[PDB]
Amino acid sequence: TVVVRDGDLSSSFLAAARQCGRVTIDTETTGLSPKIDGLCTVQLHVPGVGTEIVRVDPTLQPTRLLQVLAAEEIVKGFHHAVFDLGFLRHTFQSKARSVVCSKVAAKILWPHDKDRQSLAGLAHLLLGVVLDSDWSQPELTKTQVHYAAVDVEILPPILDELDRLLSERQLRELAVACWHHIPAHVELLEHNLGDVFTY
Amino acid sequence: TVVVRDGDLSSSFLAAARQCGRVTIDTETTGLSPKIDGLCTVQLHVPGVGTEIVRVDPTLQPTRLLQVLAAEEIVKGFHHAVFDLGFLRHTFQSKARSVVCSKVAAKILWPHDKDRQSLAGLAHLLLGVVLDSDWSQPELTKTQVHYAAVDVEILPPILDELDRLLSERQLRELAVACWHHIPAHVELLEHNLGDVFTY
């Protein structure tokens, strides 16, 4: 159900992503600064199919992964899209389209509850699920591999639930607009442009 | 060339805006807080035609003005769109489409020069033009009327010039994306939702 891939998403998962129309994605990194630290792996999950851990190769562009990220017809769900896309933007010059983010959604629904805005907070509140280091190792251990996959496999039902809550509060159109802005926000951070919406 | 209108944009200026496809807009207010202070007037300029000062009437929705603001086919140019649209959003529940802003553009081009991001800074730098109180008075004076119109009439060439500069630096697509976000940002401020793009 989980396969570690070197350099790129597999052709089989590219086709599966295209058939699904929806995937979930996150990353493992050497630190918390998208423009400085290293991108080690990208996790991609296709609901009903499984998960790939893509090990980044500095000498190889992950062509099929970048196609998925750029595809308007495939929705990419994240639990911290600005963070992950910042790494993908800085590392591969990747400009994504059709991204959604559970953190953005949770910030619209519960702006004052930081703990609810994390994926562990959301999985606990909504699903009753309690979510439990050297990602550049020559070999990923079974413990590393199982952990690396947990977040992308729990994200689809969380996103489905947040969509319903947003819709019931008449805030889904605002979330859709905010999700649409994420790639431009990532671009603003890449260029050190700051908050262009103040006065 | 300038006409003070009570309650709403005139039918003649609605037609002229539709023919032009582009207008410039700003406001006069009782203070600097869009969700607290009063919206006194809305200025609208149609290039080549003239300017209307719309005096806001609390008992009258400015129907034609709101149609212009909502029209996808009419670009509305501002020199501080988030500020002005915040007033229009709070006062009339107006949700604009196809807005552009010289301040957003200047913040992308010159992020570190606050003086260049104001309309007076832009008019001076680009055009060599040097831009020179009770907006709720029973009557607007000729001095008030001429001042209220200056900013919207100088904005069209400034926006044209900023577009060229953005395009030459390959930053126009980013500005277009940021301008597209302005109404959603205004919505976020209306709901006290803050920065939904942090982590």
Author numbering:
A (entry chain A), B (entry chain A): 10 to 141, 147 to 213
Quote from the publication:
To understand the molecular basis for the specificity of dimeric NrnC homologs toward DNA substrates, we determined a set of crystal structures of diDNases: (i) a complex of diDNaseNoc with dpGG to 1.55 Å and (ii) diDNase from Rhodococcus (diDNaseRho) in its apo state (1.72 Å resolution) and in complex with dpGG (2 Å resolution). Notably, the structure of the apo-form of diDNaseRho resulted from crystals set up in the presence of the RNA substrate pGG. However, no electron density was observed for pGG, confirming the low affinity of the protein for RNA substrates. The biologically relevant assembly in all crystal structures was determined to be a dimer using the ePISA server, which was consistent with the oligomeric state of the proteins in solution. A comparison of structures of apo- and dpGG-bound diDNaseRho revealed no major conformational changes in the protein upon substrate binding (RMSD value of 0.45 Å for 1604 main-chain atoms of a diDNase dimer). However, two minor differences were observed. First, region 142KTPRLS147 appeared disordered in the apo structure of diDNaseRho, but became visible and folded into a small helix when the substrate was present, owing to the direct interactions of the region with dpGG. Second, three side chains coordinating the substrate, H88, H89, and Y213, adopt different rotamer conformations and turn toward the substrate in diDNaseRho-dpGG.
